[PDB]
Amino acid sequence: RPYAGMPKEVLFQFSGQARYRIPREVLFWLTVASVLLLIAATIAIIAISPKCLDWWQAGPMYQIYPRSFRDSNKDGDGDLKGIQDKLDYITTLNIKTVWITSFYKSSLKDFRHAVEDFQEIDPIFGTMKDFEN
Amino acid sequence: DVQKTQPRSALKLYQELSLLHANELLLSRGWFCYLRNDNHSIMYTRELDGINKVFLMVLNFGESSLLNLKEMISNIPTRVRIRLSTSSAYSGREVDTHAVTLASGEGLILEYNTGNLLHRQTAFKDRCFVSNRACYSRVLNILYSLC
Amino acid sequence: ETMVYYGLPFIQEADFPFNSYLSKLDKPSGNSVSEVITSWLENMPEGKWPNWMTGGPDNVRLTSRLGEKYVNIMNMLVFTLPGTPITYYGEEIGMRNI
Amino acid sequence: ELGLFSGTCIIVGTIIGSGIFISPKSVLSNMEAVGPCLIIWAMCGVLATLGALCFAELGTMITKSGGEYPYLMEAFGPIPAYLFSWSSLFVIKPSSFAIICLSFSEYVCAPFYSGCSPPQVVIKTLAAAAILLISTVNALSVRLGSYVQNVFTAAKMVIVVIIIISGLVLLAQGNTRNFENSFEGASLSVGSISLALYNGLWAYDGWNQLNYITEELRNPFRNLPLAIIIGIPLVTGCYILMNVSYFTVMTATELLQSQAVAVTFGDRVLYPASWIVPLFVAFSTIGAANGSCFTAGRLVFVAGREGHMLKVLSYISVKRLTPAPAIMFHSMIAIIYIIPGDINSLVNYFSFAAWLFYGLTITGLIVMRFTRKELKRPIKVPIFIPILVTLLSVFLVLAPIISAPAWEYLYCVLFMLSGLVFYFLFVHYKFGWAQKISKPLTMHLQMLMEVVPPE
Lengths: 133, 147, 98, 455
Ligand SMILES: CCCCCCCC/C=C\CCCCCCCC(=O)O[C@H](COC(=O)CCCCCCCCCCCCCCC)COP(=O)([O-])OCC[N+](C)(C)C
Ligand SMILES: CC(C)CCC[C@@H](C)[C@H]1CC[C@H]2[C@@H]3CC=C4C[C@@H](O)CC[C@]4(C)[C@H]3CC[C@]12C
Ligand SMILES: CC(C)CCC[C@@H](C)[C@H]1CC[C@H]2[C@@H]3CC=C4C[C@@H](O)CC[C@]4(C)[C@H]3CC[C@]12C
Description:
The structure is cut from a larger assembly and holds three copies of chain A and one copy of chain D (about 450 residues).
Chain A: H1 8-14, H2 22-48, H3 55-58, E1 61-64, H4 80-85, H5 87-90, E2 97-100, E3 104-108, E4 114-121, H6 128-132
Parallel strand pairs in A: 1-2
Antiparallel strand pairs in A: 3-4
Chain D: H1 4-15, H2 23-31, H3 36-61, H4 69-75, H5 78-90, H6 92-108, H7 120-140, H8 143-147, H9 149-172, H10 190-202, H11 220-229, H12 232-247, H13 252-255, H14 261-269, H15 276-294, H16 296-305, E1 316-317, H17 324-338, H18 343-372, H19 384-403, H20 407-428, H21 432-435, H22 439-449, E2 451-452
Antiparallel strand pairs in D: 1-2
Helix pairs in contact in D: 1-11, 2-10, 3-10, 3-11, 3-12, 3-19, 4-5, 4-18, 5-6, 5-18, 5-20, 6-7, 6-15, 6-17, 6-18, 7-15, 7-17, 9-12, 9-15, 10-18, 10-19, 14-15, 18-19, 18-20
């Protein structure tokens, strides 16, 4: 009766109920219960996962005094071109943030400051394009 | 140039600490329980829930000392591994909790395994600090904020 | 007055005000350092982020304030405390004042 | 019938898929510079045209229903034809289904993890829930297979022009800082160039299954090599005009940070409605997966005649005319692929096995054209295009293993040779006991899954 090659009408006798009917719907409803239990599990993991740390909470800062870090053009005062040359040294400390103190066009470089233009780099530190590089 | 060739220098230790602080997941978002401290010594632990490993920093700001940690922490085994040291002589040497000595400016990062964390107890809820609490899941390998 | 810069739960402000209280220690004692740590962490609001700054351009460098024997113990301190460690240039090699 | 304009509109929509949204990160992490990684999309874009042209030859002269299984039967004998039927059932087709569904959860869960990478458990639990849902819908119904296809290819092209138009407008405003000093750190090496051709060519996957269109083409022989040499070269031009639109907005250092490249782009350029990119890309990526599951029952039928693969796999269910045993076996192998590996370790594993059989095919093109076969071929390609595709593919299959060896290649070579063992012990020798393990298996499966032989 099996006769493995089996067209439509013959196997409908066997596949009716005998033993192979209850596994079909119990396995079909298993894959359906799981599909909505994996999209339910991923929502439950995205919700309970806490926000990751921002860049200012993740790693140390490194405060640079720009007039004393690295001089490029032999004038005796450090500048923004010399800070850029040493950026490969700063990444061997695993620094995340480079904090550069004030470099604006100043008439007094101490006593908390005296800025002549809040949108210019002081000549001794470079030019506005040295900052963009 | 000189300090990055020497084996035990301030620059060499600084590159070991900022690397340890970068990828540990226990230093970045672990609890901070500040155990008691007499003058001339500071002790605090960093611990997370599902990590099953705590750090213990013992920093000596005094003259010198031979301090017994088994009475103070009450959570520590009798043999702990030194994850880092300021004098750098203790690269991976293990020490005895009964008698540890600190030479006037010595700091150790002791590291051991335990299931009894200090912040879960009741006597330490007054002296543990965390910004955003988050427990760890070993099977999922994720942080989760529900615990 | 410093902790007001952290903001309120509904009005946001500075991400953190810079903690310069470690830069004030002139004598390396255990209770002098312990007082700075617990004073910042208990006064801070709930879900905020601490930071530890052990030097600046406006104070004597660490090697001249405490001594060369305390350069290493002081970097291990601010890197294992909760929050962001802020380093001043030349404090990783142990510079000193001229 | 379909004209020449439609003769390309089917092929161009076929080539552009979810590869252009995932590969840029991987081709750039090996070129290291904006300049060279722009010539890779052209170099592999041309290499995909000579491939599809050579496949037009075999598609016209053999003229059989089988996709590529005939072309290896006609040239080399029965062992490469079987060895391809073996790998295209355990390696090529399942892993290409796992990369498309691994790349759909990178785009659904990237917005909810803004600023950082999502955990591996989230992008696998969401991929395993897409494979089971895509393979269950395509087994219960056929109308729902083609119901959402024409809409899913609309969202695919809506985004492709939004990224291009935006990346061109921004180029007029002078945002040229990124490719100003290109080629400066280019790490050209047989190690990197090969591994970067894998990821670039995966975005062209779908050029071999392009021969079916000749049946409805108005004038096939005159127009198909034309619809190919103007259709795919139109797509590679739409890739470098889309990979340029990435570097116009963001830098080479921020690209490697995110796996979902187009999500990083929509936040930077389309802030009022930036959710449009992760929503539309999730549409197209789940539409390209629908196309893979449809063709799973195709090759097993043609290989089921020659007694190479088991004949039960081609059986159709009676209630719904869908190849149920072919599908639920095609996806069950994919679930076992998303568990160990991730996208980058699977594009290498896929483009390795797929490219040796891509080579053996077009070498059989010349070998049959050189000595063995003298039958007439309607359209003829020059001799210099196939010798290039084989000399290129022999570099693609053999350079990665020696220069950048990995554990992914080992499991790929062990799979085919395992099928080579199944050749002699199951089909070549025809042992007596070998039969009595098959016969009770097939109809019991037929008994349990109510499936029926097709004809
Ligand atoms: C076809 C289209 C498919 C979808 C496309 C994309 C759709 C979305 C498109 C676009 C995204 C739209 C903008 C979203 C902005 C961010 C919103 C946000 O964070 O809300 C959260 C809501 O809280 C939650 O719990 C959100 C749960 C999200 C579940 C996602 C669906 C998973 C299954 C998809 C279907 C799979 C079907 C597979 C079979 C087909 C905030 O909650 P929180 O607690 O404040 O923060 C917790 C998380 N962090 C931030 C801490 C990390
Ligand atoms: C069809 C019915 C009967 C069974 C379905 C079982 C499915 C839903 C189960 C079986 C094994 C499971 C996987 C087991 C392990 C992993 C690795 C983990 O990092 C992410 C989840 C993932 C990938 C699981 C996804 C769900 C999974 C594929
Ligand atoms: C099939 C396509 C054309 C349908 C989408 C049409 C609309 C929504 C698209 C087409 C071109 C798009 C513009 C392309 C470029 C820019 C410049 C960018 O700095 C801001 C967004 C802006 C201004 C886009 C806004 C949305 C836009 C107008």
